[PDB]
Amino acid sequence: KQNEVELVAEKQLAFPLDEQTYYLSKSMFQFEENGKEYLHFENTQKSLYDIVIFDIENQQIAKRIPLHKTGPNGLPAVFGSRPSPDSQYILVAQNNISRLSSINSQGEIIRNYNFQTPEGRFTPLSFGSYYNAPAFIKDSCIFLRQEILKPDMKKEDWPRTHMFASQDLRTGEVKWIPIFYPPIFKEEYDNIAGGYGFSYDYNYKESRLVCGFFGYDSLMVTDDLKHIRWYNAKSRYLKSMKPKLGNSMEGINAIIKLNENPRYWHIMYDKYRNVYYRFAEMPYKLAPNESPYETPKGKEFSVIVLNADFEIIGETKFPGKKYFYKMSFVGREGLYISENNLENPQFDENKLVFTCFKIKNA
Ligand code: NA
Ligand code: NA
Ligand code: NA
Numbered sequence: 001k002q003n004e005v006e007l008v009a010e011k012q013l014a015f016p017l018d019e020q021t022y023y024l025s026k027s028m029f030q031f032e033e034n035g036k037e038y039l040h041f042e043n044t045q046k047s048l049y050d051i052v053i054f055d056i057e058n059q060q061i062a063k064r065i066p067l068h069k070t071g072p073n074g075l076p077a078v079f080g081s082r083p084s085p086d087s088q089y090i091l092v093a094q095n096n097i098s099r100l101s102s103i104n105s106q107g108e109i110i111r112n113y114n115f116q117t118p119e120g121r122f123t124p125l126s127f128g129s130y131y132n133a134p135a136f137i138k139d140s141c142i143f144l145r146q147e148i149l150k151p152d153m154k155k156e157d158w159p160r161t162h163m164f165a166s167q168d169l170r171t172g173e174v175k176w177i178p179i180f181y182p183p184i185f186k187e188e189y190d191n192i193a194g195g196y197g198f199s200y201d202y203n204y205k206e207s208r209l210v211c212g213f214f215g216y217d218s219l220m221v222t223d224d225l226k227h228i229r230w231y232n233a234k235s236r237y238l239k240s241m242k243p244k245l246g247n248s249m250e251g252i253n254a255i256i257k258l259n260e261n262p263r264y265w266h267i268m269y270d271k272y273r274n275v276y277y278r279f280a281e282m283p284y285k286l287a288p289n290e291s292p293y294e295t296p297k298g299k300e301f302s303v304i305v306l307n308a309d310f311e312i313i314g315e316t317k318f319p320g321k322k323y324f325y326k327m328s329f330v331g332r333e334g335l336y337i338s339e340n341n342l343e344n345p346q347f348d349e350n351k352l353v354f355t356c357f358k359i360k361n362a
Contacts, residue, residue: 002236005305005314007357013059013336015352021052021061023340023352027079027128030056030329030336033086037332038062040090041352042081042128049078050107053087054352056331065090066107073109075101080128082135084142091135091142095125100142100167113172123147123165130326132266136202136209138225141166143177145200151191158185163198163211164225178226179209184216184242193246193254201269201276206308212267212278215243219267219278219310231310235280235302237317238262252292259295260286270330273359275313277335278304279325282317297343301325303335305359314362323355334358 017023020043027042039054044067051065065087067075080093084102089110092101102110117123124147127135136143143166150157164177185196200211211220217234234240241262246254265279282300290296298320305314318325320343327338336354341347 002312003314003362005359006362007303007305007314007316007335008360010334010356010358012339013056013354013356015054015059015061017350017352020048020064021352022046022048023349024324025327026130027081028327028329029082029129029134030331031083031086033083033088038087039329040081040083040087042078044078051081051090063087063105065103065105067092067103068107073103073107075103075109080126082127084137091127093125093127093144098122098125100125102169111169113167113169115167115174117149117165118174118176121149123149129329131197131214132199132201132268132328134201136204137169138166138207140170141168141175143202145198146176148181148192148196152189153185153192154188155183155186159183179222179228182213182216182220184213185245186242187245187247189245189247189249191248193248193250194258195243195245199265199267201267203269203271205271205274210267210269210276212264213243214263214265215241216264217241219276219306221310231306233264233267233278233304233306233310233312235262235264235304236315237282237302238280256286256292259292260284260299265301265325266328268328268330268335270335272330272332273334274308275359276306276310277330278306279328280304295326297321297341303357314359316357327354329354331356 022045025041029040037056041052043052053062055062077094077096084091087105100113100115146165158181161181162176163179198213218230219233221229262283268277280302284299300320302317324338324340335357339353
């Protein structure tokens with residue numbers, strides 16, 4: 001049934017920092033290397049520009065991978081980076097210059113790739129964790145989310161718009177993947193402010209892609225990058241929903257509504273326990289002193305647990321002003337959720353803190 005399990009806090013991980021490492025990363029991923037687990041932590045916020053690898057067992061920094069802006073190993077515009085599958089070969093996204101790059105553990109460039117649409121158009125290049133969007137590698141190609149190719153989408157355009165593209169890491173060839181946006185977007189605005197986002201994860205055990213549109217009750221699953229199945233993944237605390245696109249002409253109001261309204265966020269596969277976690281944001285109303293552009297520190301959330309057959313087996317609600325759930329990862333011991341919320345009474349900008357949540361019978 002839907003109430004067999006719950007998530008329960010067990011231990012904490014705490015990494016002491018200094019001025020060389022900022023506590024926030026938008027591209028942090030757990031990985032295994034040499035028999036141990038680590039956190040790949042892209043450290044490109046503010047004036048910083050490198051990658052830090054954290055040692056989970058020893059709760060400390062393991063190494064620092066330099067990133068240079070110029071020179072023979074110059075990476076002008078890193079935003080997003082991933083262990084591929086470990087720190088010896090890392091892929092980095094450079095959206096602003098239409099480039100994907102591979103680097104080694106010393107930050108040296110292996111190869112630069114131009115990444116544009118087949119017809120030579122700019123297309124957003126990203127992967128990261130701020131919403132779970134890890135990319136994935138199949139048959140030596142990297143697969144990435146793709147955004148819409150024209151600002152004024154009609155109903156008919158969604159099922160003709162690709163959700164993913166891949167780039168061959170030998171040849172650089174980009175291919176559109178025949179997985180299309182679902183026909184669940186009704187508004188026809190001249191310019192869309194948001195509302196069609198999704199999170200995804202890739203289950204290498206079953207060669208299985210799972211996508212969760214922020215505005216939709218159901219998860220989309222495919223095992224052959226073509227044929228789609230849908231599974232209910234609705235929070236018991238939220239009214240059933242379908243996406244609501246924002247209208248750019250509404251101005252800041254469109255952004256505020258998306259920020260504050262209930263919606264889903266990460267979908268995350270747990271490779272150790274063979275379960276999925278879907279995060280859900282509870283309803284909120286943005287207060288005057290709060291920024292329209294970021295999730296409020298007080299927004300409540302839940303995590304839905306689904307088993308390997310995509311059956312909901314439990315859901316646990318979390319308070320606001322405590323967690324920074326946009327820094328979450330699955331480790332050997334469980335689901336780790338950061339406590340680096342500015343309104344947490346224990347917040348310390350020089351300590352990266354996570355709580356480990358284990359699955360217990362309810
Ligand atoms: Na120091
Ligand atoms: Na710091
Ligand atoms: Na640097």
